[PDB]
Every structure is written in C-alpha cells, then in structure tokens.
C-alpha cells in the first residue's frame, strides 16, 4: 500500500520471481506491477504436471521468499491460488416485475447463494458482480 508501480516491481515482483525460478516443470512466468500497490505473478507449468504438487512447491519456495520482502508487504500477506481465467457459466439475478430492489437482490445473492454454489462439486472459483450490505460512515472534514 502506497507504493508506485516501479517500487513494486523493484521490491516485490522481481524478488518473488527470482525465488520462483527453479521449479520442476515450469513453462513461463507472466507478471505485472500496478500503481495501486499490487503485484501479480502467474506461473504456467508444463503439460503433465500435477497441479497440487505445483501448488505445494510454489508454497515451499514462497515460504523463504517472503522474508526478503518489505515489512509493509509482509503485513498484508501474500496469497497462492491456482485457477483459470476463463468462465464456465454466468448466472444472472434480476427482478422481472421490480418487486425486489437491486440492493436486495445483490445482498441476497451474496448472503444465500454464493457460498453454497462455491462448495458445489467441481467448482473452482466464484466471482460476484454486485455487493452485499455494509455500514458506511461518511465523514465531513470540516466538522471533524
């Protein structure tokens, strides 16, 4: 948080990448650094590699790599996931007669439908378009 894309590339992505070199069946590494302080490393493996073994070996190298990061980065915590960007299905939720409001639909999807479907057999990841309810405190600087 707070760093420029160039600082991110210099201090996070390059060191994680340098540690990630040397994995068993690796094909190519694609990476990006964003001005909002976010780093992304994508590891593509060769055909016929076990995905679970790939994940655990990434974690085994990342364990030691994490000590070489800035402390601000270590505080947020770095995460390891395996998935494919494409989508199998998209479901839509809507009100045909407008009885139910958009915020009601969105909160209901987030509260009642997302978690059970993401535990369905064979589903890898679930992306949601629409937010759930939250308590917002909107401050006025002048009054503060």
């Amino acid at each position: 948080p707070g760093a420029s894309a160039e600082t991110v590339e210099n201090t996070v992505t390059q060191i994680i990448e340098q540690q990630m070199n040397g994995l068993d069946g690796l094909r190519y590494i694609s990476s990006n650094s964003a001005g909002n302080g976010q780093a992304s490393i994508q590891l593509n493996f060769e055909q016929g590699v076990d995905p679970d073994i790939a994940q655990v070996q990434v974690q085994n190298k990342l364990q030691s790599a994490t000590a070489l990061l800035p402390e601000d980065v270590q505080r947020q915590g770095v995460t390891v996931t395996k998935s494919g960007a494409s989508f199998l299905q998209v479901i839509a939720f809507y009100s045909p007669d407008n009885n139910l409001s958009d915020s009601d639909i969105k909160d209901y999807v987030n509260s009642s439908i997302k978690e059970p479907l993401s535990r369905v057999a064979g589903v890898g990841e679930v992306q949601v378009f629409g937010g759930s309810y939250a308590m917002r405190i909107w401050l006025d600087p002048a009054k503060l």
Partner: protein
C-alpha cells in the same frame, strides 16, 4: 441499526457538550463494494460467474450447479428470478450428438457399399455383425484405462469403422469366391479359406496397428490429443 452507530459517543467539549458520530458524519446502509455495475439486458442485475476446477468434467459440474440452484430456488424472495446468461455446455451436448450421428451414418454407408460388392444378404450380414462387437469392446477397453467419450475418441471410432471390417471382408470374400469356384459345403470352403488367408489377415492388422502406435508416446498438449486417436484405433484393430 444506523441510529445506534449515529449515537456512538466521541468526546466532550471544553464547554461540556458531547460530540457523537452523527455530529461529524453521515451514517447509512450501503454496499461493501462500489467498483462494478452489472446489467442483464439493460436492467440492473447481480451476477455469479463460475470457473471450473482444474480437471473436472464440465457437464457434471454444470448439472451439479443446476441441482444445487434448483434446491436453493425454493427459498427465493418474492420477485427474484435467475437465468443463465453465458453457458458453454449446450454446445458440448450438440457436438456429441452430431458425432454420434456421423457414426450411425457411416455404419449404414459401409453396409451399403459392401452389399453392393457382396451381393448376397447372408454374405453382407457377416461383416455387419462385426461392427457392434468391435465398437462396444473398444469402448469397454479404453474405459478400463481412464479414457472418456469425447469428440476425439468418437472421431477415432468413426475413422475405425471403415478399417475394422477389413479382416472380415477379406475372410468372407474368400469363402464366397471359393464356394463359387468349387461348389462345396460352407464348412469345407470356410476351412480352406481360413487356411489360405491367415497371413493376409495378420499383415493387414500388423501394419494398421503399427502405424498409430508411435504417436501415443508424444508429450505436450499435442501428445494428449494424439493419445486418444492412438489408443482407440489400436484397440479396435487388435479386436477386429
């Protein structure tokens, strides 16, 4: 409730009046995310995109999603509807249907051509009965090894149908020819025929089987694509 949050105490002033949360901010129920805007056919809508898990049958997971969703659908709020906006599985079903149709057409056409040559119905039924035994046995065997019914193994079967009737066509043809040239009982003619053509049968099978073997041993994505053809074709050739 928001009124409760509005009432959260902050401090006291030098005069002594208290400052609460309402005194410096606006309190409300809002979203936990504001960065997207979704619509279905131009109307506000929520969306759930599902991504499949690392080597799982898409058709199975789609059916499972639908079952779970159908169970959930009972407790919907009044005025809630769902509908698939983007699904790929109908195309899969359609392509499988098509490939099976081609297989059926091919078996019919092979029957017709060989009945054109082996003009007898008794004659031509003998190769025709080989099609089921070989096709079903091939399915069984490759299923033992973990292969599935995809378009690649089905293209392989369609490609095999014309080659799997070869040994039988050869066998029958010799017997019929023998029975025409020498008019003897079918048993004697068939024994003489099998004595004559064993080497032809083995050569035919040997070359056809050897041709597809090497591609089974290739790596990569291309190797996975090759292996379906190789295994299916080789198994049928031996069974034939």
């Amino acid at each position: 409730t928001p009124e409760q949050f509005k009432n959260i105490f902050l401090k006291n002033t030098a005069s002594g009046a208290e400052v609460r949360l309402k005194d410096v901010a606006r309190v409300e129920l809002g979203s936990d995310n504001y960065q997207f805007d979704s619509k279905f056919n131009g109307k506000p809508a929520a969306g759930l995109a599902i991504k499949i898990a690392t080597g799982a049958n898409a058709l199975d997971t789609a059916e499972a999603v639908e079952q779970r969703l159908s169970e959930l659908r009972k407790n919907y709020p009044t005025g809630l509807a769902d509908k698939l906006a983007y699904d790929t599985t109908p195309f899969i079903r359609l392509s499988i249907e098509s490939v099976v149709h081609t297989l059926i057409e091919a078996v019919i056409l092979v029957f017709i051509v060989m009945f054109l040559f082996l003009q007898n119905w008794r004659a031509t039924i003998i190769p025709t009965l080989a099609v089921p035994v070989v096709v079903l046995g091939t399915f069984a065997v490759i299923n033992i090894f973990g292969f599935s019914i995809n378009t690649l193994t089905m293209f392989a079967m369609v490609l095999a149908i014309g080659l799997l009737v070869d040994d039988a066509i050869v066998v029958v043809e010799n017997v019929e020819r023998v029975m025409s040239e020498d008019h003897t009982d079918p048993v004697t003619a068939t024994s003489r025929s099998m004595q004559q053509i064993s080497g032809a049968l083995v050569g035919i099978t040997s070359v056809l089987t050897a041709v597809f073997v090497p591609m089974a041993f290739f790596g990569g994505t291309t190797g996975v694509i090759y292996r379906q053809f190789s295994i299916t074709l080789v198994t049928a050739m031996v069974l034939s």
